[PDB]
Write a protein that binds this ligand. Structure first.
Ligand SMILES: CCOc1cn(-c2ccc(F)cc2C)nc1C(=O)Nc1ccc(Oc2ccnc3cc(OC)c(OC)cc23)c(F)c1
Ligand SMILES: [Cl-]
Ligand SMILES: [Cl-]
Ligand SMILES: [Cl-]
Length: 271
């Protein structure tokens, strides 16, 4: 059928030959895996700076399928997946690799924190904070419009491009909507909740959500109607937008499209 035809098309495009790739220095390293800088040789003989994340048969095919879908996304506020390679361990375990364009500014969360230090990015003005929120909304609007559920939206999963555009990516209790803590259920309105938390991380220039509240106490804290507090110097109108993301009933939360225009309107009004 066409459903399967489109899957086979996407799969054909996503794989990159291992020898078109050279891996350089480690950028990050954990239990999950590692991220390294690299170069990728393209069709025209020229090379591109990339980041490469490195993570039985079923798992690999799941990974390829998922990758194939990500690569087909095309939006300036969603990270572009250039492709994937599968390397094999000397103990016969596959080592899957995801290849993305290298973004020197790194993840939004760290950049917010560096901005509060003298050597870092300079102080980020309000207009630029809102622009980051608008960028994220635009990426999420695109993804929700094709019913992709993110499941882990947070500032640590947003990346900054060379031209300061933010894009949605994906490398957790305090980002999880109240209904998904309770009923282990997840919709786009659960993503809206996480977006609200992400807005608050941006407006606080990288604070951890819910100071004074431990993860084990989070469901109960929210059950009693408590929410993230309004940041110091956060405009009342901006706070209302984020607060709307945490309404107990998912159907009462605005969509990403509604949010995006609310944020654009606020941004245009700023003197
Ligand atoms: C919205 C869904 O997006 C995804 C789905 N998946 C996914 C999930 C499951 C699966 F089976 C398959 C895929 C493809 N991965 C992503 C994704 O965005 N991955 C990703 C994101 C960021 C990564 O890191 C970097 C990229 C670019 N420049 C960096 C620069 C750095 O320092 C200066 C840097 O320091 C650490 C890290 C950088 C990265 F290596 C990988
Ligand atoms: Cl190499
Ligand atoms: Cl902090
Ligand atoms: Cl709080």
């Amino acid at each position: 059928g066409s459903h399967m035809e489109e899957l086979q098309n996407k799969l054909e495009d996503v794989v990159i030959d291992r020898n078109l790739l050279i891996l350089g220095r480690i950028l990050g390293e954990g239990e999950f895996g590692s991220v390294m800088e690299g170069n990728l040789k393209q069709e025209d003989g020229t090379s591109l700076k990339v980041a490469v994340k490195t993570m039985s048969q079923r798992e690999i095919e799941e990974f390829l399928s998922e990758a194939a879908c990500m690569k087909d996304f095309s939006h300036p506020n969603v990270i572009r997946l250039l492709g994937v390679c599968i390397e094999m361990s000397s103990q016969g375990i596959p080592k899957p690799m995801v290849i993305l364009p290298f973004m020197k500014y790194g993840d939004l969360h760290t950049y917010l924190l560096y901005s509060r230090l003298e050597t870092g990015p300079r102080h980020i003005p309000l207009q630029t904070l809102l622009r980051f929120m608008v960028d994220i909304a635009l990426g999420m609007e695109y993804l929700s419009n094709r019913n992709f559920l993110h499941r882990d939206l947070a500032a640590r999963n947003c990346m900054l491009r060379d031209d300061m555009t933010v894009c949605v990516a994906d490398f957790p209790v305090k980002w999880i909507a109240i209904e998904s803590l309770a009923d282990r259920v997840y919709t786009s309105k659960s993503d809206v909740w996480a977006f609200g938390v992400t807005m608050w991380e941006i407006a606080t220039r990288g604070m951890t959500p819910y100071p004074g509240v431990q993860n084990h106490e989070m469901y109960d804290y929210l059950l009693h109607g408590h929410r993230l507090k309004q940041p110091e110097d956060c405009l009342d109108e901006l706070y209302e937008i984020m607060y709307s993301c945490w309404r107990t009933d998912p159907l009462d939360r605005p969509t990403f499209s509604v949010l995006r225009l609310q944020l654009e309107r606020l941004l245009e009004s700023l003197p």
